[PDB]
Design a protein around this nucleic acid. Structure first.
Ligand SMILES: [Mg+2]
Ligand SMILES: [Mg+2]
Ligand SMILES: [Mg+2]
Ligand SMILES: [Mg+2]
Ligand SMILES: [Mg+2]
Ligand SMILES: [Mg+2]
Ligand SMILES: [Mg+2]
Ligand SMILES: [Mg+2]
Ligand SMILES: [Mg+2]
Ligand SMILES: [Mg+2]
Ligand SMILES: [Mg+2]
Ligand SMILES: [Mg+2]
Ligand SMILES: [Mg+2]
Ligand SMILES: [Mg+2]
Ligand SMILES: [Mg+2]
Ligand SMILES: [Mg+2]
Ligand SMILES: [Mg+2]
Ligand SMILES: [Mg+2]
Ligand SMILES: [Mg+2]
Ligand SMILES: [Mg+2]
Ligand SMILES: [Mg+2]
Length: 48
RNA sequence: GGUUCUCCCCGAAAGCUAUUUAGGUAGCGCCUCGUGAAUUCAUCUCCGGGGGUAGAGCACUGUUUCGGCAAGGGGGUCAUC
């Protein structure tokens, strides 16, 4: 064991979602929000 | 209005209900991922059902033409208590 020979367990290091970074990533442009609503706006949504 | 690298798998809706609601939103229908479960599901053959649409008809509710019979009407001549 050395400082450059340790690795984590498989399945514990899921990567986060990054929106709006091109066509190929699957989340570009609208970034998962759809088209033209109150829910698509910055800060938008209704109270509980 | 705009939203920046790549490949693989699956894949919609533009409907119902409510709303100072109608180009917004919420529950349900429709997509995706995970888990569990029954011959659970679809096509065809045979069997058991209810029906009142298409068509037709004129006993009923309405409407329509011709012939017969004729109550009952309208117009009169004569008589008039
Ligand atoms: Mg996409
Ligand atoms: Mg989303
Ligand atoms: Mg836009
Ligand atoms: Mg729209
Ligand atoms: Mg909208
Ligand atoms: Mg929306
Ligand atoms: Mg947007
Ligand atoms: Mg905004
Ligand atoms: Mg703001
Ligand atoms: Mg744009
Ligand atoms: Mg496909
Ligand atoms: Mg459609
Ligand atoms: Mg709009
Ligand atoms: Mg609005
Ligand atoms: Mg869907
Ligand atoms: Mg499934
Ligand atoms: Mg079967
Ligand atoms: Mg029958
Ligand atoms: Mg008929
Ligand atoms: Mg009849
Ligand atoms: Mg007759």
């Amino acid at each position: 064991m050395r400082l450059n020979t340790l690795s984590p367990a498989e399945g514990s290091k899921k990567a986060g979602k990054r929106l709006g970074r091109g066509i190929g990533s699957g989340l570009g442009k609208t970034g998962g929000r759809g088209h033209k609503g109150q829910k698509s706006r910055s800060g938008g949504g209704v109270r509980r």
